Scaffold this active site. Structure first.
Site, mmCIF file in Angstrom:
data_model
loop_
_atom_site.group_PDB
_atom_site.id
_atom_site.type_symbol
_atom_site.label_atom_id
_atom_site.label_comp_id
_atom_site.label_asym_id
_atom_site.label_seq_id
_atom_site.Cartn_x
_atom_site.Cartn_y
_atom_site.Cartn_z
ATOM 1 N N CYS A 30 -20.106 -11.702 21.134
ATOM 2 C CA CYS A 30 -20.745 -12.553 20.139
ATOM 3 C C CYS A 30 -21.313 -11.746 18.979
ATOM 4 O O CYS A 30 -21.016 -12.018 17.808
ATOM 5 C CB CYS A 30 -21.858 -13.342 20.814
ATOM 6 S SG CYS A 30 -22.853 -14.324 19.670
ATOM 7 N N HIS A 79 -26.506 -17.246 21.483
ATOM 8 C CA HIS A 79 -25.144 -17.269 20.969
ATOM 9 C C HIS A 79 -25.218 -17.750 19.531
ATOM 10 O O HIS A 79 -26.148 -18.474 19.148
ATOM 11 C CB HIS A 79 -24.256 -18.209 21.789
ATOM 12 C CG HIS A 79 -22.792 -17.982 21.591
ATOM 13 N ND1 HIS A 79 -22.161 -16.827 21.999
ATOM 14 C CD2 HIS A 79 -21.835 -18.762 21.042
ATOM 15 C CE1 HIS A 79 -20.876 -16.905 21.702
ATOM 16 N NE2 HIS A 79 -20.652 -18.065 21.114
ATOM 17 N N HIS A 91 -16.839 -18.558 16.432
ATOM 18 C CA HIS A 91 -17.725 -17.715 17.214
ATOM 19 C C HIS A 91 -16.883 -16.931 18.209
ATOM 20 O O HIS A 91 -15.783 -17.351 18.592
ATOM 21 C CB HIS A 91 -18.753 -18.572 17.962
ATOM 22 C CG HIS A 91 -18.127 -19.489 18.952
ATOM 23 N ND1 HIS A 91 -18.217 -19.284 20.313
ATOM 24 C CD2 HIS A 91 -17.349 -20.583 18.779
ATOM 25 C CE1 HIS A 91 -17.543 -20.238 20.935
ATOM 26 N NE2 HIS A 91 -17.002 -21.033 20.028
#
Length: 117
Positions: A30, A79, A91
């Site tokens: 991430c 996240h 993402h």
């Protein structure tokens, strides 16, 4: 940021695999994905999701090129992704760099808000 560049760079990486700690186009996590895309246009140090939540600017709703944050594996910001318009964001998730939707039944109740670089 140059928003059009950021989103173009993010879109070009969709499909890149997940790799724990990954910071290259062979595999991202991430934070490594965000670091990589930002560093294509401005110098930023390695920074965690919580670090970006603390350092970016609060906004009422995301525009193209802003950052959306979620609670996933722990409470609070854990996240993040790049908002690309039309309720969608890119993402580096657990199974790769993907386009996901803020209206999805998993992401929506985990959405914490958006910030601007």
């Amino acid at each position: 940021l140059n928003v059009s560049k950021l989103v173009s760079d993010a879109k070009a990486l969709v499909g890149t695999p997940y790799k724990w700690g990954g910071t290259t186009t062979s595999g991202f996590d991430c934070s490594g994905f965000i670091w990589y895309v930002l560093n294509k246009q401005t110098s930023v140090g390695r920074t965690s999701t919580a670090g970006y939540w603390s350092s970016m600017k609060s906004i009422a709703s995301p525009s193209v090129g802003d950052f959306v944050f979620f609670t996933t594996y722990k409470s609070g910001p854990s996240h993040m992704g790049i908002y690309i318009g039309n309720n969608s964001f890119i993402h580096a998730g657990s199974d790769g760099v993907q386009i996901s939707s803020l209206n999805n039944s998993y992401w929506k109740p985990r959405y914490l808000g958006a910030k601007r670089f």
